[PDB]
Symmetry: C4
Subunit: 349 residues, 4 copies
């Protein structure tokens, strides 16, 4: 769903004075054909008859005007009602798949002016918005909640396995028995989890005011996952990688590329051609994820640490004195990295 | 939703005969305009024609009367039905955004008398309640259960993270590696979680008898959250703070101030102006939470233990003989404090 | 809700050929007045006119017959349709609160014959069943699911805290630091949890075929809780108690008595009058719950173990040889009790 | 639901133009009687009058035609609309339980030609699909999402218990204190959980494009359950069993036999006739699950380790040098088996 159309969907999202009107029209089983224009004068050729109101907009007035047939003309910002009961005559040569005069009129006029034309059918409790060559049929509020509510439950399930794979990876990390398969499997889950968040966004928008709780649940469930995936890529890619580079690696698998096991490892710098070999590829964490997350050391300074010790396993074996040898690591930091790592070793493993 | 309006909302909440009648009227597609007065003689200027019934109220009777057009006058305690089919004539000078005579009349009368006036649209399946300058549109039962269900799940997600943070803080507390970030990070979550409860509160009232399960769940999810937050504050404020004093800090952040990371660290007496400075501020718990929570020690008595040992870290290394010196701590209290804390140590770390 | 009425509710539960009919009648907005009799001849005085069909019952035929007005007379087992379009004339002296002839007729006739009379109102999408002095209005399927679904979520929340209190009690048990408050608090939660299961039963029935998944969720959530509460009572009551006695103690708090802290301990044999003293009452588990549950020793044989060692703490301190001194405990059992206890001590604490 | 019928159900599943049209017809309260044939000339005896359109299908066109009375004839691939307003005349000798001419005609025609015939009642919001001797009443989208949502939660509860049991078994496995009850108790739960998936499968198809989230969740909840069960069987059957052989045992219990405690212990080769005898039967895992699952060792290679060490308990005490003797186990595999198992030991026990 194009961001171009999503802004127009926002005009009839729950919470807007326009949807309040459109809801009353549906509940009362009336029909409607609304033309949203920033200037009536520009479209005098397609607007015939009806009455010239040119009055302040109001959900109550639009509903009231929807009792007469014909089309109603509103300003684009929904602050003025220009006409009512007008006969819209769009270009008859414009292709339309619709079968009824009300919707054939709506599609054609939308395609012709580039303006938003809303058509509410009398026989069906449906709102159809026509923008460019787009046609968005408004889902019923309850359905959306029910759809969004499912998306969330699917997210929670994914988040669950993600956490499990992550806590298992942490154990192999602290024990230095991690394999490419372990890393990749974990990235795949995170990526899919974030892909589902993206595929759900449009519905969170069609919900307007009513998508509040959904945004909150989503944010609580995906809070640190991206920072976590970026750190994973930084720690497990074949050759040294920059924070920013990993972030592009994250976005790439969230949109373009498919998070396939063999595809991921490839993008991480490993030349594998069969998902089985992954189990046979040993790999060691640089220590970025643990240094930042646990040790609380800024990535900038973490670079200096990894620069000198190379891997988490080696960082794990340095004294509080060897750690201070690093630019950026004083006495406190040394304690940090050291205690937080020895603490995780005495618990997780 | 002003508490003043909620009291009037209770009148048409699921479970009440009035709503029972109103639901009937909705199902049968009838309209209505109910005027609730404590004394008809006090409004004989706005009540006209109709029939004087002066009889006992009943969901069944109200429904029957709803088949007639016009208004129905009920007693404020919903025990009497005074008139039916009356013509209401309120102050015409009162501005109204409504467009239909039923609603125009409903809002003007309410705003003129301060009395409750309920309007049910004949064309829409909607109940509207006018009190002072308020207009409450009664939501369909299913929608609330839905919306309240979602809020519960939102609380759930928040409470989960709350738990992850609190348990992570505990681990740190036991290892005496706590920072200001860790503490503040936990309060914010706890604070947000209670704010959400607050915002849901009204809908739980708009469910009448149908908000029993929701009340039960909310209680199970928030049970000891407030106490826990009150305790976390007493242990981590810059300078010793009294119980009651911490509670106001708790309320303050639920309603007034926003649980913003830096705003919280300031309210606790830690002059900071940058959230990044937190990961560098070290802090030691007083021991109040653990003393009271795990060791079942009264806060007044806790004051002494903390006064003599200064930090949880020290209370943690205290011998039973050491703990006995403290005024109020007997031989049992000492074992209690001693054994309960060591038990955690061995388990959590 | 009396079991007497619940059997009659089963006649129109989803899944029954009768509800299938009643659903079609609602969806088609028709009305109906169904009289369920085991013999028409007995009620010839109240059944006038209409047509004598005396034919096989069928959801399709009843729906079809519901298009004519008047009442339809069916056999009690829903296998025959005796009449249609009949005029039912019940006792006019029987008190009724109804206001319409269709429902005044239904109530009166139900009160008079003791038979089931179903009234479906044309204006409202509602099914009203009248049995004795009972009147059950059928809830809409979707609502029930939504109600039952909430009940379940409330159960899961309770089950959650229950498990937490239980795993915390297990720790104090293995460490022998349990107090009356610890035991009681845990019983209270379990009792309430089971009380909610009972208060939900009627809805699980009104759901018929559609309550399948709900029964399954309930059973998965409450599976071992009762056996667990019985064992708790056996281990923590002041004076030795029999399995059966505890079971009556369980049922009592699930129906009659209220699971109040001070009420429970009292029933457990402790003379307390203030919920605060509970924290000051030390108590030791006999070892029944652990011996049966973990050690797998039949309660009958567990009695012999408790008879000789008295408490779990002492059972916890016996050698594999001292344990064999008990009637019923050979070499294997000794290993059992011993290893399972030492295993829990090396993990939970 | 025979797979034969599900293939025809796919035709009116959310996402298809036909259902799109059918939903329109439902909303506008129109009725319909659609006959799907691959060749009209083959049924010119049952098609009468009406209009010969022979045009391209379209959800919009079908809807338009639904305003006319009579039947509509479509091609089986839903790309052509042959007739509209036709009078269908099927074999009158075919018995039918239907009472209205539309449905009587619908069932007789379907049963006479083997072709699909869809009837939409004008009075009820219902779609009915007749194939052979089958009658599928299309459930309203919201209800399925609901019912499927509940089944997912049921799976959730089952999967939870599954997890509790499996992890409890693991603990026992590591301590070599496993009984036959513990093993069988776990399989039953695993078995029930997959049976439920099976029973839900059809509804997930009746959701068309709207069963994507449900498919995703189901996959996240059952992902490795089957493999896990296949492995638990290979480790605990009375006598060594081959992989494929265990899978049939798995299928057998999902479809045929019931996961009854005693029935399962018999299928595994443990002659028992009383569930109480189980708590007394001791059993030692082969080590296949742990070898393959945790130690990432192929089952074919696992055969050797198990062949030489007999039990997991022994594999567990095996040195790296010991593990190297086994054909197929190199220096890495040994460390893998050795380190991975010890890691569990230290963590789980
Ligand atoms: N060019 C137009 N300008 C203004 N109004 C139009 C125009 N074309 C059609 N209409 C409106 O169409 C209305 C009739 O509805 P109709 O076109 O039959 O579809 P409907 O009523 O929405 O039901 P369905 O479209 O079949 O679901 C009446 C008329 O005011
Ligand atoms: N002052 C009044 N006193 C008594 N009844 C009134 C008064 N004003 C309006 N009504 C009632 O209004 C009823 C007509 O309905 P109306 O006012 O058009 O709104 P509606 O029928 O509910 O539809 P909408 O609310 O516009 O969607 C008929 C009349 O009994
Ligand atoms: N004694 C009776 N025997 C048979 N049918 C009766 C009898 N009394 C009333 N009825 C039926 O009542 C039907 C009329 O419906 P009515 O009594 O007005 O309530 P309704 O139609 O269900 O709507 P509401 O009850 O107001 O929700 C018509 C008639 O067949
Ligand atoms: N043989 C047939 N060929 C074409 N149309 C038929 C045939 N038989 C019945 N119909 C259609 O039946 C329609 C009338 O509806 P009807 O058969 O009474 O059921 P309905 O209207 O759907 O209500 P119910 O199904 O009884 O709840 C009108 C007619 O076009």
């Amino acid at each position: 769903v194009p961001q171009e159309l999503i802004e127009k969907i926002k005009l009839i999202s729950p919470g807007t004075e326009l949807r309040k009107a459109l809801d009353d029209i549906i509940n009362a089983n009336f029909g409607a054909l609304i033309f949203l224009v920033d200037d009536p004068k520009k479209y005098e050729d397609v607007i015939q008859g009806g009455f010239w109101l040119d009055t302040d907009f109001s959900a109550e007035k639009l509903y009231e005007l929807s009792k007469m047939d014909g089309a109603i003309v509103l300003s684009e910002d929904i602050t003025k009602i220009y006409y009512a009961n007008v006969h819209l005559v769009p270009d008859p040569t414009i292709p339309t798949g619709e079968t009824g005069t009300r919707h054939r009129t709506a599609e054609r006029l939308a395609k012709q002016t580039g303006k938003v034309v809303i058509a509410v059918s009398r026989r069906r409790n449906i709102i159809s918005l026509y923008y460019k060559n787009y046609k968005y049929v408004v889902n019923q509020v309850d359905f959306l909640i029910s759809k969004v509510t499912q998306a969330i439950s699917t997210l929670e399930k994914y988040k669950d396995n993600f956490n499990k794979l992550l806590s298992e990876l942490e154990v192999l990390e602290l024990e230095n028995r991690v394999t490419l398969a372990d890393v990749v499997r974990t990235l795949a889950k995170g990526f899919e989890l974030l892909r589902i968040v993206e595929e759900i966004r449009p519905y969170i928008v069609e919900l307007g005011e009513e998508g509040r709780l959904a945004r909150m649940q989503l944010r609580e469930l995906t809070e640190d996952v991206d920072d976590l995936l970026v750190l994973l890529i930084m720690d497990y890619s074949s050759e040294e990688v920059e924070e920013e580079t990993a972030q592009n690696i994250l976005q790439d698998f969230i949109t373009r590329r498919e998070p396939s096991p063999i595809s991921i490892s490839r993008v991480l710098g490993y030349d594998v051609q069969q998902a089985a070999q992954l189990d046979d590829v040993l790999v060691s964490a640089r220590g970025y994820r643990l240094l930042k997350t646990v040790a609380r050391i800024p990535l900038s300074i973490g670079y200096n640490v990894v620069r000198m010790f190379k891997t988490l396993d080696q960082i794990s074996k340095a004294s509080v004195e060897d750690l201070k040898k690093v630019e950026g690591i004083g006495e406190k930091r040394a304690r940090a990295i050291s205690e937080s790592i020895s603490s995780l070793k005495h618990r997780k493993t």
